[PDB]
Amino acid sequence: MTQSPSSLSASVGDRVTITCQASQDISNYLNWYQQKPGKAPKLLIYGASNLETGVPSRFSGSGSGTDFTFTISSLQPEDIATYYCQQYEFFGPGTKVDIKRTVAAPSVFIFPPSDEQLKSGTASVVCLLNNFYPREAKVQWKVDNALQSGNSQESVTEQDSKDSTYSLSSTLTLSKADYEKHKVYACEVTHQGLSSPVTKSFNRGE
Amino acid sequence: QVQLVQSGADVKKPGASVKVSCKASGYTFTDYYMHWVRQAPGQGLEWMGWINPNSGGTNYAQKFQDRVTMTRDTSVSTAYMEVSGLRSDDTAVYYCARIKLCNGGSCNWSLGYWGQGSLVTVSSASTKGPSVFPLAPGTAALGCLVKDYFPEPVTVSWNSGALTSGVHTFPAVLQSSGLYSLSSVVTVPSSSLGTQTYICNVNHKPSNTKVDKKVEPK
Amino acid sequence: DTITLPCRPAPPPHCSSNITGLILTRQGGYSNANTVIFRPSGGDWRDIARCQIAGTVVSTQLFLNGSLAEEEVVIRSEDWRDNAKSICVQLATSVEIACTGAGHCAISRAKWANTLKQIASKLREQYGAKTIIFKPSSGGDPEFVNHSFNCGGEFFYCASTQLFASTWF
Ligand SMILES: *[C@@H]1O[C@H](CO)[C@@H](O)[C@H](O)[C@H]1NC(C)=O
Ligand SMILES: *[C@@H]1O[C@H](CO)[C@@H](O)[C@H](O)[C@H]1NC(C)=O
């Protein structure tokens, strides 16, 4: 059907409002689901306003006819999930709810390639960013003080359900021959919580 | 007590077929229809159809008509959903679900119980087991690099599950060569290095491999 | 001129009945077209039982020798929006079904084409100015994928795929 907004951020204790519109007068035959990363959708509201057994009182829903509302009265950090409305076989596109919190600086770690991987002819260089906020960060790979771009891939975790932070990994993949032709390997991080960029480096063969 | 246990992950060739099972327990199987819903990676939910376990009748979404077959086995209270002519856009997690009575009758589609979902990948690439390399380390970080496997997923544990706090298993990235790769890291007190042994347990069911990898400092 | 239903076992001629109604299932999902598809019911004996329009003949898919409506075709459903709810059809004029004793039953094709037109006209009152298409049973167990009925101490199974294959505007 239709859902508004498509995504929203809110602080712990905030009021969250999600709206779903139907095309036809379905009376109150509306359901609402919460889907946390990595698991099946979970029914929270049925019949537009009824709460599923065991659901905390901060969840509620209202509406009738075509216009319906889903409300989290006081947002908790474990409420980060995508919320779907549903009427009969038709699911709404979902509203993704995440949490804004205080700025947290990233702790940076760099990992050289293991000698075991060098036997296969490939070298992976890993840069870890652990428990930061906001999500926006920039990781630059520098090899012999030369900016590398196009040979690295990043992966970010879903926002942590306790402290509402993120973790990021960036992996630089080079050939073994290309790896032994340079000395200094470094990843420099730029983040809102860092007054100056942080560079973690190592020398090959140390 | 009610649970729906579905079949494991699977990879199938484009144009072929896949059959997903879902075994029920904790209730009378014939009292509730079985629904099937899929979810493409990072996308919404899509209902494909239901089956009446008393009569075998079905009602598919027109989008899947003449392409999907739903059957059941009451003696083991299992429902099956076979999807043929698979295309790249059939890559999804396939869920079985049943409703919970509404108390008042407005919940004929309120799926209160879901299975864990079955990830079906549609590609021509060969199933490939992962290689496991250590990411060697008052806080210290260490982890395991799980590279070059196909399809998804890979599950990661640390110290057989005794280590969970500080554990970050990253989503897998598809590399340029068409194989998957991920990392799982953990932050531990630097004083514990050398005293506490750290082992990451990698599991990749599609290739039926288990790796127990102890990460040591240099 | 007639529509033929393959049955097993062979119903004798005194098993000939009057079709007084039937029970349907509306196909779900997005349509990507201005059409609505109906098939014989995907339900079971409870959908038939809640119809309350049968007489003294135990049958699936079609109701035989039941009670007819008084003015025109009447269609009843718990929730029209719910595809998991069967659509019960009560006819105002009965349609003869005759079985020859050789293994097949026959229904007039002009009479049945008149009856589906009345049904499709009634469904468009509930679903709008859309094309009404009836298709065969989606599948299931023998006594429900076929029009099955009891007659004289014996249970017969008749395929009905020829009764549900038309498009109406
Ligand atoms: C059908 O109904 C008509 C009208 O009562 C009746 O004359 C006829 O015998 C019935 N046919 C059967 C086969 O019962
Ligand atoms: C329907 O009624 C006619 C006449 O009353 C009877 O001969 C016939 O056997 C009935 N049909 C069935 C299936 O019993």
Against chain C, the chains showing at least 3 CB pairs within 8 Å are A, B
Length, in residues, of chain A? 206
Report the distance separating Cα B186 and Cα B198, nearest Å. 9
Same domain, B65 and B48: yes
Whole-angstrom distance, CA of residue B99 vs CA of residue B5: 16
Does residue B185 contact residue A169 with C-beta atoms inside 8 Å? yes
Give the phi and the psi of residue A167 in degrees, each rounded to 5: -130, 145
β-pairing verdict for B17-25 and B78-84: antiparallel
Q: Are residues B91 and B25 in the same domain?
A: yes
Q: What are the structure tokens assigned to C20, written together?
A: 């007084």
Domain termination site, one of B67, B94, B122? B122
Positive/negative CA dihedral, C38, C40, C46, C47:
positive
Contact A29 C81 (CB under 8 A): yes
Answer yes or no: is the C-beta of C86 below 6 A from any ligand 1 atom: no
Tell me the chain B residues in contact with residue A87 when contact means C-beta distances shorter than 8 Å. 109
Domains of chain A by residue range: 2-99, 107-203
Write the burial class of residue B24 (CB in 10 Å: 0-12 exposed, 13-18 middle, 19+ buried).
buried
Of C65, C67, C99, the residue with max ligand 2 atoms within 8 A of its CB, to mutate for a pocket test, comes to C65
Collapsing DSSP states into helix, strand and coil, what is residue A116? helix
Gaps in chain A (C to N over 2.5 angstroms) fall after none
Sheet with A152-156, side-by-side order of all strands: A107-111, A122-132, A166-175, A152-156
Instruction: Report the alpha-carbon distance of residue B173 to residue B145 in Å, rounded.
Output: 12
Does C83 reach chain A within 8 Å, measured CB to CB? yes
Residues 6+ apart with CB under 8 A from A25: A65, A66
- Phi, psi dihedral angles at B18 (to 5 degrees): -140, 140
Question: In ligand 2, which atom is closest to the CA atom of C152?
Answer: 14
The contacts of residue A10 (CB under 8 Å, 6+ apart) are: A16, A75, A97, A99, A100
Whole-angstrom Cα distance, residue A29 to residue B105?
9
Can you give the three-state secondary structure of C75-92, one letter per residue?
A: EECCCCCCCCCCEEEEEE
Asked if residues B158 and B187 have their Cβ atoms less than 8 Å apart, the reply is no
Q: Does residue B102 share a domain with residue B39?
A: yes
Backbone angles phi, psi at C94, to 5 degrees: -75, 155
What architecture is domain A107-203? Sandwich (2.60)
Close Cβ partners of A101 (under 8 Å, ≥ 6 residues apart): A11, A12, A133, A163, A164, A165
The whole domain housing B174 covers: 131-214
Please indicate, yes or no, whether residues B114 and B139 belong to a single structural domain of this protein: no
Identify whether residues B96 and B54 lie together within a single domain: yes
Name the residue facing A26 among C29, C81, C83 (closest C-beta). Answer: C81
Regarding the domain with residue range C2-168, which homologous superfamily does it belong to in the CATH classification? Human immunodeficiency virus 1, Gp160, envelope glycoprotein (2.170.40.20)
Residue C94 near ligand 1, beta carbon < 6 Å: yes
What total of structural domains would you count in chain B?
A: 2
Task: Tell me the CB-side half-sphere exposure of residue C131, using CA atoms within 13 A.
Answer: 10
Where along chain C do its domains lie? 2-168
| CATH match for A2-99 among 1.10.287.110, 2.40.180.10, 2.60.40.10, 3.40.50.11600 | 2.60.40.10
Q: Which of B116, B114, B17, B31 is nearest to B72 (CA)?
A: B31
Closest CA to B47 of B101, B2, B108, B105: B108
Resolution (Å units): 1.9
Alpha-carbon distance of C7 to C101, in angstroms, equals: 10
How far apart CA A68 and CA C24 sit, in angstroms, is 31
Breaks in chain C after residues (C–N exceeding 2.5 Å): none
**C-alpha distance from residue C90 to each of A92, C45, C117, C124, C145 (Å):** 36, 17, 14, 16, 20
The encoded tokens of residue B137 equal 């380390």
Q: Which of C39, C52, C54 is nearest to C140 (CA)?
A: C39
In which region does residue C93 sit, left (phi positive, over 0), alpha (psi from -120 to 50) or beta (all else)? beta
Q: Provide the token pair at A27.
A: 């009376």
N residues, chain B:
218
Across A29-68, b (16+ Cβ under 10 Å) vs e yields bbbbbbbeeeebbbbbbbbbebbbeeeeeebbbebeeeeb
